[PDB]
Amino acid sequence: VDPQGQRTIGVITKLDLMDEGTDARDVLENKLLPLRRGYIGVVNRSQK
Amino acid sequence: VDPQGQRTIGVITKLDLMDEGTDARDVLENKLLPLRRGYIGVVNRSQK
Amino acid sequence: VNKTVRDLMPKTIMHLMINNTKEFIFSELLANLYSCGDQNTLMEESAE
């Protein structure tokens, strides 16, 4: 719906639930899928 | 491609990385999504 | 001859297939099911 990505903001949740030895550096540095507005990483409250 | 699920085997992976305080019991017991052959949970080697 | 084969194709199928599988169900199914081994596993309680 927003091809140029001018009114789109990407947020990455659950950064505490990633597999051992893996990290979201490549996506949070906006390199894996370059989006204009960048990716903001948040960590909400778990179900517990 | 297999409506009645005659030849469909459901497999559930990464059971050691579920969101804390949650469990896929209602899936592994073929309760959530009815499947003819049922689901089989497996835990593989982590990336580390 | 079309009339005579049209009146005896149904009857031929059913007297051999349907009106025999019905009697198999009503008579012999119980014997096979009870005679097959491992009674304790023939009736598995489902988790549900």
In angstroms, the CA C8 to CA C16 distance is: 12
Where are the alpha helices (H) located in A1-48, listed in sequence order? 25-28
Distance set, CA A39 to CA A4, A17, A19, C25, C33 (Å) = 15, 17, 20, 64, 61
Q: Which residues contact B12 (CB under 8 A, 6 or more apart)?
A: B24, B27, B28, B39, B40, B41, B42
- How does strand B10-12 pair with strand A39-41? unpaired
Which strand (E) or helix (H) includes residue C16?
helix C9-16
In angstroms, the CA A35 to CA A31 distance is: 8
Q: Is B10 helix (H, G, I), strand (E, B) or coil?
A: strand
Is the minimum CB–CB distance between B46 and chain A shorter than 8 Å? yes
Backbone angles phi, psi at B27, to 5 degrees: -90, -45
In angstroms, the CA A41 to CA A39 distance is: 6
What count of residues does chain A have?
A: 48
User: Do chains B and A have 3 or more beta-carbon pairs under 8 angstroms?
Assistant: yes
Contacts of B14 in chain A (CB under 8 A): 19
The residue among C1, A45, A35 whose CA lies nearest residue B22 is A45
**Is B47 annotated as belonging to a binding site?**
yes
Question: What type of residue sits at position C12?
Answer: T
First to last CA, chain B: 36
Backbone angles phi, psi at C46, to 5 degrees: -75, 150
Eight-state DSSP code of residue A4: T
